[PDB]
Symmetry: C2
Subunit: 257 residues, 2 copies
């Protein structure tokens, strides 16, 4: 089981077998990657930073509990530049959370190490009040325009949607980024290449307001059985999405409360 | 906003304009369909049974919360054959849940009114002890074999879209139906149509056992952030899937 695999992994790590390590580590689901990593002593963590790129390390951090508390120093032991690149690769919702956990000093220092484009989304979402949709949503969603074909929509997905949180829902917006429709991937794939998105999209797209209370958001997810839900401002501008995996954590919090 | 839509609907009922009703009703998400239905009296409800086919009504009952002390009455007030056909169209996990909320007699009643095939999976999952994986899983999952092209896989996916519980995780089983791997529709979409499933499938497949406690299943879905999780027996035979939307109800239950 888990034990066996981790043991082999620890050995490739010590013997500094970079490629063997990478193959094994990267074969693990990001949650298992997190457990393995959270078991390592400070020495082995360092080696690990040498065999994984900031993007790869970010995939794992996305799921490590930011309240862990051993944060601060996980990031501290990292070369500031490396940490910053890693924060810039995590999903925005997770990045914002990490930052709000570090001491007020670290937060600005790491944030300072990022370019304008790298910190852009992180800076917007930091503004949202804790426990509101804006505070638990993320920016990596897929949006397209109506007067496009499925062939065209499907091209974005295949060659231009690697950064997206999820592609299982495709949101349709107009030029001003107004949310005007939605189409699930499962409805999309069964349509002809030439069909126009505008002809098969759903006009009754359900969304929440960026200032709504997480509990209300959770209720929407609970009622509609959605794996994600779009977030907008009063003007209906698509700002982000809240995913079911995070809502579960929210639900866990409300209960324990 | 929602109160208005419902008004235009209730109106098509008092007017008995089947076509107009169906176009407005079927435009709603099944949850809103459920609320509309649940706010009707005996007679508009009856009208609804006339304007909706069993599988259409099933699409809605799938999300109607059993334990609602009305199922007994909802099913009772509708034509036996109609109600039976509606059970056969609901997703298996939900059909089993509804049946177990009905009087031992009624359960037998509708059960007997179903063909061997219509009731197959229903009767299989009916024997699973309450609160175990088997008791909260469903059978409408998509499985494929490792030695085929992505194109072949996609072909199967499109055909299952309409019936499967979900097509976002595709399970790979062997000739004997042993769970050997898994691949997400997302990975399929970004791979070349020529690529062989066996070359891109994930070997480390996470699963749970039919007898596992729902709480443990809930924990697994919580940690791995899964939309669904496969269920097997001790011999690794893929028996079904437990989806995230249902695990949330489990979690609500486990809480207070
Ligand atoms: Mg977190
Ligand atoms: Mg947050
Ligand atoms: Mg639900
Ligand atoms: Mg959505
Ligand atoms: Mg998230
Ligand atoms: Mg139910
Ligand atoms: Mg229990
Ligand atoms: Mg059940
Ligand atoms: Mg989780
Ligand atoms: Mg279900």
């Amino acid at each position: 089981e888990m034990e066996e695999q981790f043991a082999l992994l620890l050995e490739t790590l010590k013997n500094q077998q970079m490629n063997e390590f990478r193959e094994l580590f990267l074969a693990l689901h990001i949650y298992e990657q997190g457990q393995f990593y959270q078991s390592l002593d400070e020495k082995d963590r360092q080696h690990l930073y040498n065999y994984l790129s900031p993007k790869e390390l970010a995939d794992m951090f996305d799921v490590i509990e930011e309240d862990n508390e051993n944060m601060k120093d996980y990031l501290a032991e990292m070369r500031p530049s490396y940490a910053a690149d890693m924060l810039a690769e995590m999903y925005t919702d997770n990045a914002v959370d990490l930052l709000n956990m570090l001491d007020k000093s670290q937060k600005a220092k790491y944030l300072s190490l990022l370019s304008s484009e790298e910190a852009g989304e992180i800076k917007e979402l930091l503004h949202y009040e804790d426990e509101t949709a804006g505070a638990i949503m993320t920016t990596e969603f897929v949006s397209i325009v109506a007067n496009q074909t499925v062939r065209s929509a499907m091209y974005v997905l295949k060659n231009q949607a690697d950064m997206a949180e999820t592609i299982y829902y495709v949101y349709v917006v107009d030029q001003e980024n107004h949310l005007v429709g939605v189409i699930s991937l499962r409805d999309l794939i069964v349509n002809d290449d030439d069909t126009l998105i505008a002809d098969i999209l759903n006009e009754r797209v359900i969304s929440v307001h960026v200032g709504d209370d997480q509990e209300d958001v959770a209720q929407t997810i609970r009622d509609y059985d959605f794996l994600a839900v779009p977030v907008t401002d009063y003007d209906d501008h698509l700002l982000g999405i809240v995913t079911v995996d995070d809502i579960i954590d929210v639900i866990d919090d409300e209960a324990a409360s």
